[PDB]
Amino acid sequence: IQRTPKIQVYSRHPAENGKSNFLNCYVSGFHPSDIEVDLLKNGERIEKVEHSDLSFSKDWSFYLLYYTEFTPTEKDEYACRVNHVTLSQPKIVKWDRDM
Amino acid sequence: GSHSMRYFHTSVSRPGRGEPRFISVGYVDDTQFVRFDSDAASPRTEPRAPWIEQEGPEYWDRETQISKTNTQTYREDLRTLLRYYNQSEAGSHTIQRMSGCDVGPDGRLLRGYNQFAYDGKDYIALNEDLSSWTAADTAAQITQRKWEAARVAEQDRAYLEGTCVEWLRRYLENGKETLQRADPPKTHVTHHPISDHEATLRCWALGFYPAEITLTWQRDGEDQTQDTELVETRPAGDRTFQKWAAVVVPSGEEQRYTCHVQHEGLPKPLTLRWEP
Amino acid sequence: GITQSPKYLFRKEGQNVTLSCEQNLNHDAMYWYRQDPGQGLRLIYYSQIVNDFQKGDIAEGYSVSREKKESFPLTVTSAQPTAFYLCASSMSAMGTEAFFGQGTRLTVVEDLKNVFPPEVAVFEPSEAEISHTQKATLVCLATGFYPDHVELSWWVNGKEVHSGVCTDPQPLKEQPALNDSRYALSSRLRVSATFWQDPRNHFRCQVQFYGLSENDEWTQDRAKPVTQIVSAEAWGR
Amino acid sequence: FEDLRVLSF
Amino acid sequence: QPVQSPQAVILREGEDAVINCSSSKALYSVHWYRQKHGEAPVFLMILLKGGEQKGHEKISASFNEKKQQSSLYLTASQLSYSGTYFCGTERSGGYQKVTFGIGTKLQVIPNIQNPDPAVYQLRDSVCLFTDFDSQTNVSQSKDSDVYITDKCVLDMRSMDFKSNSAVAWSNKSDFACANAFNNSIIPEDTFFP
């Protein structure tokens, strides 16, 4: 059985313009494990991107954390490009400070 | 109060690409301490928590052998489940195992675990009595019967009652300052108007350990959970966690009710009310 | 069950031989042991699954492979002397019972010219034994054979005997000083006076010797001491 | 501390 | 690693033998095997717990409180109980291997109801010392050309008659039937025809 990931784009600490932070993407609830998560800066990929070790919840659904060091600015835009078996085209989720 | 130790296993068959992948990750409550991915350059049981490096070379050496064998064990299981489930070789499949135990504040075993899943859905789980098996279907019953004859459940019970309790008690002790430290959430409410006649009250909780948290939006009276939207408790990437809960409040004389937050790191359950 | 091959095997100096062990019980775990007097059973190599095998404690001189669940063969190289190798296989080990194979007797023969088959002779029970007790004892002697790759078997009226059959647990060295000394073994069959005194009762005594093969190169004046059955025969009196 | 898999399927 | 207490024992027929074994590291299970020197060790029983199990007479075993020390009990010892008893020890993660130590060499001696010490000469040329009690110890052969075998117990299941024996033979002309057994502790009332 296939399950669609629940993409969430957020920061390690609250977004302060010009001050250092981490941009996280937490994909959850997906099955199979074969996922492709890319982190974008103004519609462009990042080379320096690490990730957490493959693990799941009680309901067997998988979870991964993709993260990178960043400096938030009111001009720079951050988003996430995720693809999985369940998706026909890569889904993009926009980073929002307000909510 | 309570504490848990878990060992998550994942075995993914990738035919047409190559040999299967085996990744075993250990957790003490919500903190990762070990990692063994067979897809690494030099597969080895590696530290993941600072409070685990104090373990001697023998600990790592014995765990690496257990994992280098488990890799070959799960290989055979991916093959066996093709025969059992009347499946062909061409396809890509997944085997998951969840081992470990929950212990109460008194350090005594509360519940023992030895669960398995095939392709997302359940396979074979060990019953709470640590004697009987729950097969998901008649193909899993073949494993239930293979294991009953070979007295598998007895071996698990020995580890879950013994080994697992003793190791969890040791891990908590080494990681005393971290694993047993209360970290409460950083609470605040954000207000955004979804329209002109309606608004959203999102309740934020950030930087908290452990993961267990209850966020309930109540409109004067308790039961308002059927219309509140909440995300999955997400990790910050520095041991601590995050979570929000948003209810869609109307517009007028309505932004007067409160939100309630429960976390074991809190001396009392906190109550939040928004105003500009 | 489990089939460990061969029962009897010889080895030349600096030679490598691969011992077999196959099962069908679908057992995950497989074990190889070396039995020596006073040392007891000792674990050479073991395997709990396919592709994975672990060493300890007797090695080097030994190598194994686990390409299938069914087979776990042990290759004994140029290092090690003479010993009895046993082979076990359990379903899930630890926990379950381990079932064994017949065993393998491995002797290092320096030169093929030392290999000799047995000289088998049968001794008729004494009349003084029947006159003193209504019981008659037959003796079978295997003399001048090398190595100790033999199995004694009494046959009365074409059927294999076991009641009143008595073979020496250890053979005698014909030349105690020498190591490559030939062996002697005695087996004895006792029956009542009536059975031996009847002429229609037949007394055969088989000795199965394991020697050289078809592949072996023999040069000497003697006949090739190949794997053979040499037996002495006795009749009723 | 993880132990070996008890028995295969 | 697995230590066996008797390591070697000789007992009379029917006599009650007690084999003991211990470990230093807590074992999950203990196996007991009996072997006939050049054969496959035959499985007796396995113990997972934790107390006494099972009291099946003739061949029954015990596993102490927690854990390591297991003992095997043999009650009405029969002639078939002879051989090497081995203790198989199995340990938790990741010491999963059946480990054996130096087994105990158990020897059951027949209780000769009606001994008749006698040395006979069999047709072709061979000496047979037979029907001698188990206390009689046939040992050594000081002469080089003289070959004397060890004691070997024969069992006429047909009549329930068991008997000890030793065969002697030599190429020498001086090899006498009466003089055949001297180094061996031979009784006074020994029969010589």
Author numbering:
A (entry chain B): 1 to 99
B (entry chain A): 1 to 276
C (entry chain E): 3 to 239
D (entry chain C): 1 to 9
E (entry chain D): 3 to 195
What does the report in the manuscript say about this coordinate set?
We solved the structure of the EM2 TCR in complex with HLA-B37-NP338. The EM2 TCR docked centrally onto HLA-B37-NP338 with a 66° angle, falling in the range previously observed for TCR-pHLA-I (average of 63°). The EM2 TCR α-chain contributes to 40% of the contact surface, while the biased TRBV19+ β-chain contributes to 60% of the BSA, providing a direct basis for the TRBV19 bias observed in HLA-B37+ donors in response to NP338 and its variants. The peptide contributed to 25% of the pHLA BSA, with all six solvent-exposed residues contacted by the EM2 TCR. The peptide is predominantly contacted by CDR3α (47%) and CDR3β (26%), as well as by CDR1β (17%) and CDR2β (10%). Therefore, CDR3α loop forms a lid-like structure that covers the N-terminal part of the peptide. Interestingly, the comparison of HLA-B37-NP338 in its free and liganded state with the EM2 TCR revealed that the peptide (r.m.s.d. of 0.2 Å) and HLA-B37 (r.m.s.d. of 0.3 Å) did not change conformation upon TCR binding. Altogether, the structure of the EM2 TCR–HLA-B37-NP338 complex revealed that the TCR is using hydrophobic interaction from its CDR3 loops to engage with the all stretch of the NP338 peptide. The EM2 TCR bound to the HLA-B37-NP338 complex with a Kd of ~130 µM, displaying a low affinity for an antiviral CD8+ T cell, the average being 35 µM50.
